[PDB]
Amino acid sequence: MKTQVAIIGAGPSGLLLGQLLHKAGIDNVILERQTPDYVLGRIRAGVLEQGMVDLLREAGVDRRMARDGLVHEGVEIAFAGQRRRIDLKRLSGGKTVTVYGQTEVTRDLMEAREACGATTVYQAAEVRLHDLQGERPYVTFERDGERLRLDCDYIAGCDGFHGISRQSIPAERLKVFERVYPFGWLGLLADTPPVSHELIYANHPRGFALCSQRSATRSRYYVQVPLSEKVEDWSDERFWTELKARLPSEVAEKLVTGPSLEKSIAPLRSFVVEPMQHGRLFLAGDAAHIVPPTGAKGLDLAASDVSTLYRLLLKAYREGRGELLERYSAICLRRIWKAERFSWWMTSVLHRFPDTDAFSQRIQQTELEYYLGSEAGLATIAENYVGLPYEEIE
Amino acid sequence: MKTQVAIIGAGPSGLLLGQLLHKAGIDNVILERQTPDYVLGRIRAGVLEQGMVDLLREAGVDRRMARDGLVHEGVEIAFAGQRRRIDLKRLSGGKTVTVYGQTEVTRDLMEAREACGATTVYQAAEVRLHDLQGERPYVTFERDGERLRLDCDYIAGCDGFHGISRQSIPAERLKVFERVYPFGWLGLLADTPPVSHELIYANHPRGFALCSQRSATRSRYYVQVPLSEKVEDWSDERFWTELKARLPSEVAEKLVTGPSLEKSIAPLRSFVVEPMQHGRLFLAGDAAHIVPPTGAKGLDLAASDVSTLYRLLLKAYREGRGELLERYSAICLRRIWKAERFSWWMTSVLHRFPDTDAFSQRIQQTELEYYLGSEAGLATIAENYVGLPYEEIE
Ligand SMILES: Cc1cc2nc3c(=O)[nH]c(=O)nc-3n(C[C@H](O)[C@H](O)[C@H](O)COP(=O)(O)OP(=O)(O)OC[C@H]3O[C@@H](n4cnc5c(N)ncnc54)[C@H](O)[C@@H]3O)c2cc1C
Ligand SMILES: Cc1cc2nc3c(=O)[nH]c(=O)nc-3n(C[C@H](O)[C@H](O)[C@H](O)COP(=O)(O)OP(=O)(O)OC[C@H]3O[C@@H](n4cnc5c(N)ncnc54)[C@H](O)[C@@H]3O)c2cc1C
């Protein structure tokens, strides 16, 4: 079998690269280990920034987001009795963030790709990548017991942290940067009206909590939990009590609780790999980099990687200027390390850390009292939260 | 013997409190373990901010600083080949910093106090503090073998980190916050014209370096050195070679070197104690708090403590409103913890740390690439470097 671009993974990154390219006359095939159903069970992300809003419009898939997504102009941080709002519209010069669930984003792109008739093979087993430094790479895989060959020009690894494509690169050609954090986020999605018009992040003695939303009648809540915990030990009851124990009393009394639709523990991680390419293989999104979700940056980096990868592949097919695709990693990593620093600062000022000594607790709070009470301090959080500018290409 | 205020220590803090009070008709005695000569051998500080410039004028001791001090409008940070200037005048709204040596500051106040005839006892041995929670405290001490009694109303501990007065408080009434850093600053003062019109701070692979000045013909240089080192192992030659090894090549070639006037290793420390008072005893300056010299904040906190202590003692004697001196610590500590966070951030982004793993080196550099390339990021360093506002009293 044959195609121009082969994309491994059909989550936000595989599907958006796939769509942008189909619209530009550049053929592509997506390969996904799981089912449409299993991919849609993953609740993940609520907050989108301008880059990803503009790209979903560039791929003509913006309709349901323009009606149903929520434009937010501020967010609140709760610490030590206080409750402080960062006005993102004015501390960043008009930028806002968009609340629209990741399940929904994925649904819009799964419906769009289906309508145009571009190839997608779900349940594609044991994907292997071959001949990466040659002029004609290929993907082998198994569909219902039969082992098949797909030839392409170029391969995009959009397959997440556990995907086969970063492990398909010689480990000596790669430099891994990692930090594991001693906690996870216990999440709980409920069909309840949210506790505030805006998102509330909270540093509490007992550990972190976050009040998010998916729409006017759906809510997403997290509490920081230890690496030892397991979801079957946190009953809906247990959770709501602990979430209320971590909020300002006049937020917790206004809380409308209800039964979970979904409950799960995500571990926290900072991960970068350099380079983000090998030969004809280009890693994008979570294949190449993980951030802790505290700063809402995961989909911010997927969109700029994908925007950069699409823009350089157009130049390579429409324009014959194919030399420029070796500029991929250097363009991407400048943006990855600033969103990685933002995601770590966020994480470390808002979570409770094991065997923190007296001095560092005091510094952590003073960090929050400074950045939130200073015009310039606030603007450093706000321009990072709404996304920094994109980079020059040529 | 008797006085109104007794001040333990005749460095920048004891002398400035002492002077301000003599001018307001409030009598005071200073007690100092060492000699005038030994106190003046201590080279310490080069950078002063607006609060301390204005206070030295309030105490009428500003003359030689107005002629001889240097007004600086920017400072430079060197990291990874780059060399970036923070314009402090415009990123903070007109504020500047003053380069004038601490030896000189102390000399101006030792000469002023001498002219007015206010009491100073140098070589005062084994100062003990007695009866602190009573209505009539006193200092005992020994002058040339004879053990003498000094009665006062109130005592100011302006005696540094090693002073007897913080140890004179019941250890249970105190909460100590401390961080020891795994390095020191090797310093070297030379009678050479400085390498730049402005101060250069440098993060280099080999460890930290700083290019400072005392005037157009005198220079102050430091290199970060390990806690194991001893000054007799660093010859002037050894030092100059290492300082040149840590600078941008086109700074190191322009360097005019020469023999040391002074050479010494200061260990780095963050220290806070809460409260900053006990009964009739009020700690000020370095008695109460230590910062690493990276942010030039030590004399910034001495001046606001002293300004606050003077202002509340005037109110207590001129106005009979003596209740307000229990507001001392809460007023001071708000300013101490923001200058302590600034001094730690500074310290950790610019020094080389032991068993730093791949991820944190990358974050440390990304910290520097962000704060220096963002308008808001730069303003957070600049308003902290020139000193934040002072606090409301009433
Ligand atoms: C709790 C949580 C909250 C988050 N909240 C936010 C938020 O508000 N905002 C934000 O910006 N980010 C957030 N994120 C991050 C965001 O969810 C991710 O960055 C996003 O899912 C990345 O898209 P992706 O397509 O690159 O990878 P994924 O979404 O992981 O998709 C990769 C796909 O590849 C498939 N694949 C894997 N291995 C193979 C293989 N061998 N062969 C074929 N296919 C394979 C997988 O089955 C999967 O479908 C959050 C993440 C978590 C965990
Ligand atoms: C390398 C270095 C560089 C620095 N650079 C700067 C800079 O550029 N800018 C800045 O803002 N800060 C800087 N500082 C900090 C600044 O030097 C200090 O904060 C400053 O000396 C504090 O003044 P002080 O009077 O409170 O304490 P000190 O200056 O320490 O004086 C206290 C005095 O009390 C006396 N004393 C002690 N024990 C007793 C006792 N039992 N009885 C009686 N008297 C006693 C001592 O002998 C001494 O004279 C630097 C410090 C160092 C170490």
Side-chain angles (χ1 to χ4, degrees), chain A residues 23 44 61 76 133 140 142 182 233 252 272 306 321 352 373 376 386:
Chain A
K23 283 196 61 65
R44 305 275 176 102
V61 202
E76 180 156 46
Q133 277 167 139
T140 50
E142 294 170 10
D233 292 3
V272 180
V306 160
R321 283 195 180 148
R352 141 61 53 84
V386 292

Side-chain angles (χ1 to χ4, degrees), chain A residues 274 357 362 370 374 383, chain B residues 179 274 362 370 374 383:
Chain A
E274 323 188 334
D357 59 9
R362 261 282 196 304
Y370 173 66
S374 149
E383 64 176 8
Chain B
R179 171 67 69 254
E274 323 188 334
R362 261 282 196 304
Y370 173 66
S374 149
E383 64 176 8

Side-chain angles (χ1 to χ4, degrees), chain A residues 177 179 270 274 337-338 341 344 357-360 362-363 366-367 370-371 374 376-377 379-380 383-384, chain B residues 177-179 270 274 337-338 341 344 357-360 362-363 366-367 370-371 374 376-377 379-380 383-384:
Chain A
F177 299 79
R179 171 67 69 254
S270 290
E274 323 188 334
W337 283 112
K338 304 172 175 299
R341 183 210 72 68
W344 158 78
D357 59 9
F359 187 72
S360 306
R362 261 282 196 304
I363 286 301
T366 299
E367 287 276 84
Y370 173 66
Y371 283 89
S374 149
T380 71
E383 64 176 8
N384 270 278
Chain B
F177 299 79
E178 182 180 352
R179 171 67 69 254
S270 290
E274 323 188 334
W337 283 112
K338 304 172 175 299
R341 183 210 72 68
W344 158 78
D357 59 9
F359 187 72
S360 306
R362 261 282 196 304
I363 286 301
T366 299
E367 287 276 84
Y370 173 66
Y371 283 89
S374 149
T380 71
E383 64 176 8
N384 270 278

Side-chain angles (χ1 to χ4, degrees), chain A residues 8-9 11-13 31-34 39 42 44-47 102 127 158-160 163-164 222 266 285-286 293 296-300:
Chain A
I8 310 300
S13 297
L31 292 179
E32 173 63 55
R33 188 198 211 55
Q34 308 309 139
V39 182
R42 297 199 259 252
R44 305 275 176 102
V47 171
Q102 189 178 316
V127 163
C158 304
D159 47 347
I164 185 57
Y222 313 84
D286 267 25
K297 302 286 119 209
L299 258 25
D300 195 357

Side-chain angles (χ1 to χ4, degrees), chain B residues 230-246:
Chain B
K230 49 209 253 71
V231 63
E232 23 282 303
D233 292 3
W234 284 86
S235 54
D236 299 348
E237 183 173 353
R238 191 166 169 215
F239 179 85
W240 287 120
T241 294
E242 189 63 62
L243 197 251
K244 287 165 175 165
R246 292 182 195 191

Side-chain angles (χ1 to χ4, degrees), chain B residues 85-93 374-376 378-379 382-383:
Chain B
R85 184 185 137 130
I86 300 156
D87 206 327
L88 310 168
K89 244 249 153 56
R90 63 139 165 141
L91 271 323
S92 72
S374 149
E375 275 290 300
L378 293 170
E383 64 176 8

